[PDB]
Design an enzyme around this catalytic site. Structure first.
Site, PDB file in Angstrom:
ATOM      1  N   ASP A  86       0.803  -1.217   0.000  1.00 35.81           N
ATOM      2  CA  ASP A  86       0.000   0.000   0.000  1.00 35.81           C
ATOM      3  C   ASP A  86       0.843   1.278   0.000  1.00 35.81           C
ATOM      4  O   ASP A  86       1.364   1.681   1.038  1.00 35.81           O
ATOM      5  CB  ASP A  86      -0.920  -0.015   1.222  1.00 35.81           C
ATOM      6  CG  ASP A  86      -1.990   1.050   1.164  1.00 35.81           C
ATOM      7  OD1 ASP A  86      -2.776   1.154   2.127  1.00 35.81           O
ATOM      8  OD2 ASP A  86      -2.050   1.781   0.157  1.00 35.81           O
ATOM      9  N   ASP A 145      -1.484   5.535  -5.545  1.00 39.88           N
ATOM     10  CA  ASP A 145      -1.873   4.650  -4.460  1.00 39.88           C
ATOM     11  C   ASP A 145      -2.160   3.228  -4.922  1.00 39.88           C
ATOM     12  O   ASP A 145      -3.225   2.947  -5.473  1.00 39.88           O
ATOM     13  CB  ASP A 145      -3.098   5.220  -3.742  1.00 39.88           C
ATOM     14  CG  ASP A 145      -3.506   4.392  -2.547  1.00 39.88           C
ATOM     15  OD1 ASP A 145      -2.683   3.584  -2.076  1.00 39.88           O
ATOM     16  OD2 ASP A 145      -4.647   4.548  -2.078  1.00 39.88           O
TER      17      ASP A 145
END
Ligand SMILES: COc1ccc([C@H](Cc2cc([N+](=O)[O-])ccc2OC)c2c[nH]c(N)n2)cc1F
Length: 372
Positions: free
Chosen positions: A35, A220
């Site tokens: 992440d 992201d």
């Protein structure tokens, strides 16, 4: 080199990519989501219906309790844990073992996904967005400090069992083609960048470039879709609609609710436009653009090929998620405070179109595109 790390990512569509990591002594194996949109190393550390494995601190001779808790509200749900440290390593990564902060998740509500291959999260963003505060050193920071691994990692997210590569400490040439173009990292919290122009099939969206980055634009890997501000999303969809008017789709499709299907092997890719984001360049008044195809923003989900519209509305700014990342080899050059984009060697395309990274282009007042 880096061949040890190539293909070290797996994933389930819409659920992110995870790398295999071990925590503790003796080592305990877990699948950790990669992440770049968060900054905590957090892992399930107590029984849960959705966790078929978890970090058992009591079984690690190298565990240390930081005697502090962390409470993270996530949308409609949350997770809580006990902060601590322990020895961490990546079987298919650099040959290093590091002591890192670990958030032992002991309680959660509507957090872990039903039947998801990952038991934890590897937040690769910067400390500023780390919970509970910026004094919990993010994992990659400890990795760099404790070893000689260069301050840099790259991601090749391939899609449709999805797979990819996380190359820690280097750039693997076999993962991309043509040139790498770099955009500056505006600020070190998220991997924030500045989009200075948007095109749908060559047609300028023609908005105050501040709208593209309102209130921010980040890269992201922890987000599936390309998510755009309301004004931008609205324009983008209107334009994408026009561009593909030869076929009409139920308004539910443009909302990501309904699917769209075609006879296996007959998806009309070409009626769909490409999408170009121009990113602020490294040189003054110079930008470059990255172009993705419907094969990126039409997420595959019978004897037909069915897809969901993977571009959605955001209120927290632009999120260049997997929809974007899956077209490119993305280099997170922390050392030089910049993010590289190159056409991905594994991206999905047809014989007529391909994801692209082209430049340079003369662009003035690129600083003005940044929102404050
Ligand atoms: C430090 O606290 C959190 C870290 C990450 C998330 C999710 C991780 C996640 C990713 C995906 N996914 O599809 O990759 C699906 C579900 C997820 O959480 C259950 C997330 C949201 N956005 C980002 N960057 N990540 C939520 C947190 F509260």
């Amino acid at each position: 080199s880096f061949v040890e790390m190539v293909d070290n990512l797996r994933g389930k569509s819409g659920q992110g990519y995870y790398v295999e990591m071990t925590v503790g002594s003796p080592p305990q194996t877990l699948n950790i989501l990669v992440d770049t949109g968060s900054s905590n190393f957090a892992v399930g550390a107590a029984p849960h219906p959705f966790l078929h494995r978890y970090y058992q601190r009591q079984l690690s001779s190298t565990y240390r309790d930081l005697r502090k808790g962390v409470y993270v509200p996530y949308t409609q749900g949350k997770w809580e844990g006990e902060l601590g440290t322990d020895l961490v390593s990546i079987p298919h990564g650099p040959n290093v073992t590091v002591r890192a902060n670990i958030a032992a998740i002991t309680e959660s509500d509507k957090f872990f996904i039903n039947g998801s291959n990952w038991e934890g999260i590897l937040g690769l963003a910067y400390a500023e967005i780390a919970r509970p505060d910026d004094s919990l050193e993010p994992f990659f920071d400890s990795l760099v400090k404790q070893t000689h691994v260069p301050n840099l990692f790259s991601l090749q997210l391939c899609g449709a069992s999805v797979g990819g590569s996380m190359i820690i400490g280097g750039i693997d040439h076999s993962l991309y083609t043509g040139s790498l173009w770099y955009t500056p990292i505006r600020r070190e919290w998220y991997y924030e960048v500045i989009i200075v122009r948007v095109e749908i099939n060559g047609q300028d969206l023609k908005m105050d470039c501040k709208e593209y980055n309102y209130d921010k634009s980040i890269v992201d890997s922890g987000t599936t879709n390309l998510r755009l501000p309301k004004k931008v999303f609205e324009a983008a969809v209107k334009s994408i609609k026009a561009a593909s008017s030869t076929e009409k789709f139920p308004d539910g499709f443009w909302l990501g609710e309904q699917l769209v299907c075609w006879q296996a092997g007959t998806t009309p890719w070409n009626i769909f436009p490409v999408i170009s984001l121009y990113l602020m360049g490294e040189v003054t008044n110079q930008s470059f653009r990255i172009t993705i195809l419907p094969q990126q923003y039409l997420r595959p989900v019978s004897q037909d090929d069915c897809y969901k519209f993977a571009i959605s509305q955001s209120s927290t700014g632009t999120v260049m998620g997997a929809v974007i990342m899956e077209g490119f080899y993305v280099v997170f050059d922390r050392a030089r405070k910049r993010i590289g984009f190159a056409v991905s060697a594994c991206h999905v395309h047809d014989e007529f179109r391909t994801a692209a990274v082209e430049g340079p282009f003369v662009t003035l007042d690129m600083e003005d595109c940044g929102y404050n």
